[PDB]
Amino acid sequence: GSSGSSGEVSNPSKPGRKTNQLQYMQNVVVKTLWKHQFAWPFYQPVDAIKLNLPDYHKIIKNPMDMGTIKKRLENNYYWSASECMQDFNTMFTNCYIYNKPTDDIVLMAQALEKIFLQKVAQMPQEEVELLPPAPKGK
Structure with a gap:
């Protein structure tokens, strides 16, 4: 498979569910890195069209940005x-x-x-597994 992607946000083939370890990543690690004074150029993937980088994927083997890291934590992509x-x-x-x-x-x-x-x-x-959430009321 040739290069032409930025990864995924959910996956049915790979095992995964909501755990305390993934909770710490999305609740403290990402949370604090996103509140940082220099988080802003990582909030989104590099649009090589807008940045005018005609060789971006020729150097970059594996494009990855904080806005996509959180988008798989918001799902069950992995277990750990x-x-x-x-x-x-x-x-x-x-x-x-x-x-x-x-x-x-x-x-x-x-x-x-x-x-x-x-x-x-x-x-x-x-x-460890997380405790169950509170019920809706809308």
């Missing part, structure tokens, strides 16, 4: 937070490949990544 961690790694790494090591977007990714590592370091190492 180690997959969300590898997506965060893939976002920061693909940014470092394409750009100069002194460009603003690299310094932004370096400042987000240090917080990401401090946050997942405080995530549990064991995994």
